[PDB]
């Protein structure tokens, strides 16, 4: 079980000085999704490369998926799958985009209705308002709860703006059965934000099953 | 813009029975959680119920419990109130209220009233 | 009386500044965020401060919320005629699961 955040751990969002619209793009509308698909190519090792077409409303045909290790990959290559993530058109050497993680296996992981997930808000130690995300899948990764966690704040309490964010810190723990883990909200310290190394953090393709997993946001305030 | 619109309130004898209305208009009903709150002449605001965006969730206040039932129509875009075995004590303005945000559970630690309210007067 | 309690009435000159507090338990304000609501004699309630502090739009900065610890304050300054009104806090309580509001504070802007 990951230990919670120590004092001044958390990334201020003061200490960011370049534009919050590059972190708030990828917990907007635009997100990549697919259901029931194959890899098709191999860049490197540890990644796997998909045929997902949004191009009617995306502008995205060819994706890279890129995993922490050679494991994953393998474990995904020739299976049918369901992939869910915020993607970076930054720059990866691979029209074309790339993400990390993301990806279940189709097979026997639908339900027959969507199950709702309560998120529990905080702001200053005290919560602030709790709210639903839907998923339909038994087991799903932590970067799509996130991403829905997140898209819900953006669109609802403005957890990223193009120039700031109303909140200093922010960071999401997910606990299940007495274990738990977080993410970190806000970007690194600077005047740039590193697209591809935040989303780095999904490439574990981390997982937790939607029956029992609790999520928990905490926010403060500058 | 978002409009709200109580309506049902009138003269009841004690021990009787009245359904209050309230047509929502201006956000996707459905999305939202709705609140009931009523304030006796003179005296302050008193929360009533709720019921959640998709009807799973009702409470009640104490001193309505087993009178009162938050019931919801998505079709006309309506929430209502059975409000049975009316007392003196319930005579109040009924003043309707929707979440500020879609989707909410427990907490509401505010509610938006837009309302003028409907008055509701129980007297022999 | 009242699950949340805040003094009966306050009062001012025009220009000049109030605090209205409001006071709970662990239950409700020190657990939750609070939400305030004023009322103009014989209109309606309306949401005047949320999440302790946010305003909602049309609501000017004169008007402002603080916390400390079990208790929360609505602070008005520049005071104006128009803000003669009743003041209510609200906020969840997880105890009667139900939203509690205050007593209610009538402010009189003296003249």
């Known amino acids: 079980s990951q230990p919670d955040p120590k004092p001044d751990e958390l990334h201020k969002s003061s200490k960011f000085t370049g534009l919050m619209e590059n972190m708030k793009v990828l917990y907007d509308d635009n997100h990549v999704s697919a259901i029931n698909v194959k890899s098709i190519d191999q860049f490197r090792y540890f990644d796997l490369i998909y045929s997902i077409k949004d191009t009617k409303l995306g502008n995205y045909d060819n994706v890279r998926v890129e995993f922490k290790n050679k494991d994953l990959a393998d474990k995904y290559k020739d299976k049918y799958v369901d992939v869910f993530g915020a993607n970076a058109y930054y720059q990866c050497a691979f029209r074309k985009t790339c993400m990390y993680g993301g990806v279940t296996e189709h097979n026997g992981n639908q339900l027959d209705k969507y199950r709702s997930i309560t998120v529990r808000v905080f702001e200053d130690g005290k919560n602030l308002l709790s709210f639903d995300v839907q998923t339909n899948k038994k087991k799903v990764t932590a970067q799509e709860l996130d991403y829905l966690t997140r898209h819900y704040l953006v669109k609802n309490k403005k957890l990223y703006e193009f120039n700031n964010s109303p909140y200093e810190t922010g960071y999401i723990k997910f606990i299940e059965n007495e274990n738990s883990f977080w993410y970190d909200m806000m970007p690194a310290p600077g005047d740039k934000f590193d697209q591809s190394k935040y989303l780095m953090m999904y490439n574990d393709n981390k997982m937790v099953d939607s029956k029992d997993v609790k999520i928990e946001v905490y926010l403060t305030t500058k | 813009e978002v409009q709200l619109v109580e309506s049902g309130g009138g003269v009841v004898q004690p021990g009787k029975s009245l359904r209050l209305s309230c047509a929502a208009s201006?956000?996707?009903?459905?999305?939202?959680?709705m609140h009931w709150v009523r304030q006796a002449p003179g005296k302050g605001l008193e929360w009533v119920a709720v019921?959640?965006?998709?009807?799973?969730?009702?409470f009640y206040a104490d001193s309505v419990k087993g009178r009162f039932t938050v019931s919801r129509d998505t079709s006309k875009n309506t929430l209502f109130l059975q409000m049975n075995s009316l007392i003196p004590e319930d005579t109040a303005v009924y003043y309707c209220?929707?979440?500020?945000?879609?989707?909410?559970?427990?907490?509401?630690?505010?509610?938006?009233?837009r309302g003028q309210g409907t008055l509701v007067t129980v007297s022999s | 009386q009242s699950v949340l309690t805040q003094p009966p009435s306050v009062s001012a000159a025009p220009g000049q500044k109030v605090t209205i507090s409001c006071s709970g338990n662990?239950?409700?304000?020190?657990?939750?965020?609070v939400s305030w609501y004023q009322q103009v004699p014989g209109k309606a309630p309306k949401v005047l401060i949320y999440?302790?502090?946010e305003r909602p739009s049309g609501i000017p900065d004169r008007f402002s919320g603080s916390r400390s610890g079990t208790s929360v304050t609505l602070g008005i300054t520049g005071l104006q005629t128009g803000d003669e009104a009743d003041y209510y806090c609200?906020?969840?309580?997880?105890?009667?699961?139900?939203?509690?509001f205050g007593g209610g504070t009538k402010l009189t802007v003296l003249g």
């Open positions: 209220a929707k979440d500020p945000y879609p989707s909410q559970r427990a907490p509401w630690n505010w509610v938006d009233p």
């Open positions: 201006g956000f996707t009903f459905s999305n939202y959680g």
């Open positions: 019921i959640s965006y998709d009807g799973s969730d009702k």
């Open positions: 662990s239950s409700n304000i020190g657990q939750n965020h």
């Open positions: 999440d302790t502090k």
């Open positions: 609200g906020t969840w309580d997880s105890r009667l699961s139900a939203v509690v």
